[PDB]
Amino acid sequence: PIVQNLQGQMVHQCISPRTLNAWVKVVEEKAFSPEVIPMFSALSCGATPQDLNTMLNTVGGHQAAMQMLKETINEEAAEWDRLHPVHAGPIAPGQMREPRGSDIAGTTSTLQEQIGWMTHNPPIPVGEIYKRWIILGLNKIVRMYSPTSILDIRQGPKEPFRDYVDRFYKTLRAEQASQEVKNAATETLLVQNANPDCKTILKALGPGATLEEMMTACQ
Amino acid sequence: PIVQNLQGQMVHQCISPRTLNAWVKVVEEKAFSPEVIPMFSALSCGATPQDLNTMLNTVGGHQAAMQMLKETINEEAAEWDRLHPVHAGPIAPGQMREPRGSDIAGTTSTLQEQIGWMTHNPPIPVGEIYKRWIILGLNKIVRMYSPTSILDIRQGPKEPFRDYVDRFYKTLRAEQASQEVKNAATETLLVQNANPDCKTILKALGPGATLEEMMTACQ
Amino acid sequence: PIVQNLQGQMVHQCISPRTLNAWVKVVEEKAFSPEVIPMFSALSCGATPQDLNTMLNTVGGHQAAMQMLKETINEEAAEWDRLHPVHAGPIAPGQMREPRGSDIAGTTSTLQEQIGWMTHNPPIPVGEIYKRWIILGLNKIVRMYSPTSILDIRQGPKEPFRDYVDRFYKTLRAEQASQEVKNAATETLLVQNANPDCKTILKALGPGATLEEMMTACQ
Amino acid sequence: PIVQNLQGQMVHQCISPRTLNAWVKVVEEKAFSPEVIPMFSALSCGATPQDLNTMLNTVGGHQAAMQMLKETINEEAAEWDRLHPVHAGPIAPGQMREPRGSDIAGTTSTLQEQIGWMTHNPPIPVGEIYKRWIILGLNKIVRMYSPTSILDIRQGPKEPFRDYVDRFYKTLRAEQASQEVKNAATETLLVQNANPDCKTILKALGPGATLEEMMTACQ
Amino acid sequence: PIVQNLQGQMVHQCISPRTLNAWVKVVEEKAFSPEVIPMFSALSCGATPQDLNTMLNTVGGHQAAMQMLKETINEEAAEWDRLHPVHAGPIAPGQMREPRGSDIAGTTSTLQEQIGWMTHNPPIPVGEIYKRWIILGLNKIVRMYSPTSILDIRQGPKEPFRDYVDRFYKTLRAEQASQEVKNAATETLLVQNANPDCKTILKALGPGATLEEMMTACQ
Amino acid sequence: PIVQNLQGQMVHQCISPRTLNAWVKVVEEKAFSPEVIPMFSALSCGATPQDLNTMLNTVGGHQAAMQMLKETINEEAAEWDRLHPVHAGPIAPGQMREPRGSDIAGTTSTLQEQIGWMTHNPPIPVGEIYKRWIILGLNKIVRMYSPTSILDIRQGPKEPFRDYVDRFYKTLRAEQASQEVKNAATETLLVQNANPDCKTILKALGPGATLEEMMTACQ
Ligand SMILES: Cc1cc(O)nc2ccccc12
Ligand SMILES: Cc1cc(O)nc2ccccc12
Ligand SMILES: Cc1cc(O)nc2ccccc12
Ligand SMILES: Cc1cc(O)nc2ccccc12
Ligand SMILES: Cc1cc(O)nc2ccccc12
Ligand SMILES: Cc1cc(O)nc2ccccc12
């Protein structure tokens, strides 16, 4: 990654064994549960494109997902190239060349180039641009790997309402509902999919109940 | 987080893998037992709003709780906006804009903005303001998830008084009794809810016995 | 805690995840065995009152003990206030106010205040003052939780004398005997409570035998 | 490795116990699964030839692989010597000598020599040159140790298409197919090797389906 | 401990959680096997008397040993006081007082005093003086806790000679034989205590065989 | 060890708990398998003779090996003394004395002396000289503890050739064959010791086959 040292200047530091192992182990343990994405983002703080590729390439399973991710990255790289075409022919001696989409993705750029861009004044944030492409891809993966529709999350007859709600919002998260829908669902699908006893109680509370209010009511 | 380096200036540092894993694992192990809150506060020392969101978003279960927390945060953000309305229209070039409630919560502000506020002289402590909202929300959660009323904590006939007292004050803590009530309860509900043999002994000691004195008496 | 950086100036550093987890886990594993107290003292090296409260508040069980500790702290705070009363009314602008007992204990003081006191020239050592109160309280707890009188530690007929001595001095430690008594006990209760065969051998060695000498004799 | 300290100058640092143990343990756990290579590259960030040899020599099993690697390194060293012959006879006093292939590989050079080359302006990147030879060798090993031809990866009748795709691309990776072939295979061998039900569905989608599209179709 | 910072000046640093846990766990696992002593010495590198007491006081079992150690320390402290008597009466204002034996042992000195002595030019090495007393005591403990005389280490009839030799020299180590005796024993007791078949072979090699030579001979 | 700080000057640093535990645990797990030696060398990067002795003395078993090592060290020390005799009589005040063999080995030198030599301009590399003696000794140990002659490594009738080759070269390594012999063995003993089916196939390939070629052939 690129860090500020103890003296305020931005320099390259090797990716740490702890960071490498943390990411491999979260993928092993959680696969593409939604919470793996914010973990990826945090563990890749400051990353160069080289570091992001290292993190993705150290994953041993999930190769269908990794090939889907490659495809997303290639789409975003192509759109970059559409928006930001680069001069053909020779680089000005000693000067910085402009990045292509494949330079952003770290396949045609060197670490030195990458450091040059990321530490330029002002920075050309190749690491952050690539990380956005990767996260776009990983969200597609999360949605693909979500095993259950929200329509099929219904409260069991002897299921504690809190347990039901946890299943409901875990499913909405994987299915990638917007926050508007998460906030809205409380007035609707969450009640509809409740068991008959809680549904009666929730219908009585009337509209505009907070989730806290609904959860207290059905405790 | 924002730290002071080895040379006394406040700078951003990436959240560490150890901090990320510590928080995920405490939630896995303890859920919303009351002692998880001081742990959250300590593990988020120095945090930016980005870092607080990272910590909350890396939690995989408990999504009913996380949706309740979102609701609390939105209430506090709305109250901030009531108290501290911001100018509409364009920012003075190069200058710092004033934070909105959603800027505090990290959803409409960038990391750079956040660092700018938190390192301003004097700081506009967006991380600490957000952390207070979050902790308000988490306390609501702890209270919701407390499984037992204090009324139902009574000493068993062969239960060591120390064991009973531990259950009693663990319950008062989750139920969020004030410290006045915790200090008061010793003169009352703790005795009333004691078994007959200890109750006799405690009633005899008379008023103003310390908890130490009561515990010695019923050993 | 407050540390000296690499350049010799005293600054605040966040409590580390390793320190947080070390303390929780020692309480989980050892409860209030006497050796937990020196561990607490070491793990709280440099602590502010905020940090000491964090350490105490991250403990999930033992709430009878934690309420006993609160009571001790309140007694010491009241004695501080008796010895060091503070001016009522407004603070001199920009200047440091004098700490009250509750400021020492971190309940009415901010982290900034605490850092101010602890880094004043000369320091007003609020962290060390509070840590002394806490340790006074924890020693009371250790004594309360000691399960066995020294009178009841007697050597079994087939118990190795070394094993007996270990039980004896582990018990004296929990019971909080002074060092005078620990050094004295060797001439007396340790012999009296020995089995008949070792008692014969020890009685023969005569007075002024070292513990090493007694242990060799009964090997 | 050679790192930049906190003050911007390139200096030698000892290889860490964490790095040493991470590499031994990844070889123990994964042997020569393809993802071990990017792990090696990351764990050897900044390495001198001494450090790369340390990493390879700390492996206890896999000695057939390690002898194959020695053979690769000797081939690359011989090609270096063909391209970059060095002066015979005495070194200019106090001056840097040019590296031979065996100097690159760390067998005839000292750590001091290595540091000299790697910190020269401009650097003679002996660590990076050697690491390229090693990785060439390790890729040969991965290909050798791949247990299954792609021809033999076919979807079972009750095998989820996602599971099949994961096996397919894990095999292509070990077999060291180019990225062109990985991207191409989607239009062909992946369909051909699908079970009859998915094959029907995929054949219907028509050409130019993304992997995401194929995977959705056969869910 | 007292360390040199990154800038070459000697300053106090808190004892680390890793060091605290390493020592507790080595005592738990190995008790007073001889190799615990060099471990203690290494883990206490740079220690103040406060730190050495912390390490000894964090041990929960072995209290017979810890009382024997207290006795040794008191003997060494008394001998210090005989050799280095200190002025009675008041300290010169602002100046350093001379340490007494109990000051060395950390019971009557403050951390500040200790740092003052250890960082004086030239240092009065209170930490190293105390560590020598402690190690004298711990060696006595190791010898006491050695379970077997060297006379009783004899090779079994089907015991590999290497296994026998390991038992022999592990016992000599615990019994605290000098190095002269360890080097000598090879010509004598080690042969005498060998089984008849190896004894024949060793007797034939003649005098002045190395241990390597003896071990090869009886392989 | 002696390290360069963050500012480029060579100073002493305490051996770390991680390094201490890594070495003890590798000896516990691997004993004197050949790969323990490069691990020792890496874990002792920068070591003083004090640190090397600490590492060797923290090993609890293997005392026959440790006594063999002492014997090697004494031989090398005696040869040092033959090559580099030192002046008898008093040291020039304030000046550095020349090391004897026992000074190199850390038994008659202080840490301060050792640091003085190792940080002299130019250094008198006592740590590196001692480490060479130790490694000479440890290699003797590895060879002694190798359980099987290469003559006895033959391919089983249903043993995969790769498995056989791994056993073969693991044995050559422990038996301490030169690299010439390791490279040569491929043309000979490795074929001779192959099962009849692979032997036929290897004999047909003809001379000068790479190990890769032989391994492919017998897959
Ligand atoms: C662009 C890219 C380069 C790479 O080295 N590995 C990747 C792994 C998965 C997705 C994309 C990748
Ligand atoms: C405001 C906010 C942003 C976010 O990214 N996650 C949160 C997670 C739980 C609660 C609030 C949240
Ligand atoms: C004064 C005080 C404050 C706090 O926050 N927790 C404590 C926990 C136990 C004992 C005292 C305490
Ligand atoms: C050139 C080289 C030196 C070495 O010390 N070990 C190696 C281990 C495997 C492959 C090559 C190696
Ligand atoms: C002098 C001394 C002080 C202390 O606090 N504990 C010790 C523990 C064991 C031995 C000696 C000790
Ligand atoms: C010279 C030397 C000193 C020591 O303290 N221990 C050693 C342990 C094994 C081998 C040699 C050793």
PDB file of C-alpha atoms and ligand atoms in Angstrom, chain E residues 173 179, chain F residues 49-50 52-57 63 65-71 73-74 102 104-107 130 134, ligand 6:
ATOM      1  CA  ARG E 173      21.428 -30.115  33.284  1.00  0.00           C
ATOM      2  CA  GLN E 179      30.445 -27.852  32.210  1.00  0.00           C
TER       3      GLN E 179
ATOM      4  CA  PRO F  49      26.685 -14.215  20.588  1.00  0.00           C
ATOM      5  CA  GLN F  50      24.420 -13.637  23.647  1.00  0.00           C
ATOM      6  CA  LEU F  52      22.686 -17.151  19.736  1.00  0.00           C
ATOM      7  CA  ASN F  53      23.315 -18.715  23.194  1.00  0.00           C
ATOM      8  CA  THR F  54      19.824 -17.707  24.254  1.00  0.00           C
ATOM      9  CA  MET F  55      18.330 -19.474  21.274  1.00  0.00           C
ATOM     10  CA  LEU F  56      20.368 -22.666  21.868  1.00  0.00           C
ATOM     11  CA  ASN F  57      19.777 -22.617  25.674  1.00  0.00           C
ATOM     12  CA  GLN F  63      20.474 -32.506  25.076  1.00  0.00           C
ATOM     13  CA  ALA F  65      22.660 -32.851  20.313  1.00  0.00           C
ATOM     14  CA  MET F  66      23.346 -29.799  22.445  1.00  0.00           C
ATOM     15  CA  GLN F  67      26.366 -31.453  24.077  1.00  0.00           C
ATOM     16  CA  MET F  68      27.655 -32.496  20.538  1.00  0.00           C
ATOM     17  CA  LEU F  69      27.218 -28.813  19.532  1.00  0.00           C
ATOM     18  CA  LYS F  70      29.219 -27.640  22.523  1.00  0.00           C
ATOM     19  CA  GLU F  71      31.991 -29.925  21.454  1.00  0.00           C
ATOM     20  CA  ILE F  73      32.016 -24.964  19.206  1.00  0.00           C
ATOM     21  CA  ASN F  74      34.965 -25.751  21.465  1.00  0.00           C
ATOM     22  CA  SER F 102      35.369 -18.078  24.029  1.00  0.00           C
ATOM     23  CA  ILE F 104      33.137 -15.167  20.117  1.00  0.00           C
ATOM     24  CA  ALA F 105      31.060 -17.933  21.704  1.00  0.00           C
ATOM     25  CA  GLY F 106      29.769 -15.516  24.303  1.00  0.00           C
ATOM     26  CA  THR F 107      30.997 -17.314  27.398  1.00  0.00           C
ATOM     27  CA  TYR F 130      29.832 -17.715  15.984  1.00  0.00           C
ATOM     28  CA  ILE F 134      26.997 -23.192  15.274  1.00  0.00           C
TER      29      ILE F 134
HETATM   30  C1  LIG G   6      29.084 -21.961  23.923  1.00  0.00           C
HETATM   31  C2  LIG G   6      27.634 -22.250  24.450  1.00  0.00           C
HETATM   32  C3  LIG G   6      27.197 -21.414  25.463  1.00  0.00           C
HETATM   33  C4  LIG G   6      25.907 -21.562  26.004  1.00  0.00           C
HETATM   34  O1  LIG G   6      25.524 -20.616  26.984  1.00  0.00           O
HETATM   35  N1  LIG G   6      25.110 -22.555  25.524  1.00  0.00           N
HETATM   36  C5  LIG G   6      25.497 -23.320  24.463  1.00  0.00           C
HETATM   37  C6  LIG G   6      24.602 -24.326  24.071  1.00  0.00           C
HETATM   38  C7  LIG G   6      24.872 -25.298  23.161  1.00  0.00           C
HETATM   39  C8  LIG G   6      26.123 -25.129  22.578  1.00  0.00           C
HETATM   40  C9  LIG G   6      27.021 -24.183  22.969  1.00  0.00           C
HETATM   41  C10 LIG G   6      26.738 -23.300  23.995  1.00  0.00           C
END
